[PDB]
């Protein structure tokens, strides 16, 4: 199932804001920043917390929970900026909200890039 496995897919597809699992990304895709969809670029630190999105997979027709962990403690990657907002909500639904820095509780809160970790079926 290539649709569930970004490392097997075309890099150009995964590095697009239109890639299905990036449906609530407000930030730079870590896969364009020397990392991958599920690994921080070298010398940047995963956030223990995240906003969560529910994204539809058009390939297998199912909906998945996505956790948008950031990588932190390096300055802005600047590449592949996305601002997608499917099912995103304001700060009174805080863990569905993406206008805050999810590096906010890291040892260093400087925002580097954001990614889309597949948690499971919605």
């Amino acid at each position: 199932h290539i649709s569930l496995n970004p490392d097997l897919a075309n890099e150009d597809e995964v590095n697009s804001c239109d890639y299905w699992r990036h449906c609530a990304v407000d930030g730079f895709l870590c896969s364009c920043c020397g990392g991958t969809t599920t690994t921080c670029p070298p010398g940047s630190t995963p956030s223990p917390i995240s906003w969560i999105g529910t994204c539809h997979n058009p390939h297998d027709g199912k909906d998945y929970l996505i956790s948008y962990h950031d990588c932190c403690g390096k300055t802005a990657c600047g590449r592949c900026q996305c601002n997608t907002q499917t099912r995103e909500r304001p700060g009174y639904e805080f863990f569905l909200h993406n206008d805050v820095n999810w590096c906010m509780a890291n040892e260093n809160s400087t925002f580097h890039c954001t990614t889309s970790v597949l948690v499971g079926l919605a």
């Binding site: 599920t38 690994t39 921080c40 670029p41 070298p42 630190t45 995963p46 970790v117 597949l118 948690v119």
Partner: peptide
Amino acid sequence: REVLTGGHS
């Protein structure tokens, strides 16, 4: 499913 990791070269 997946887990975000750092520490990579």
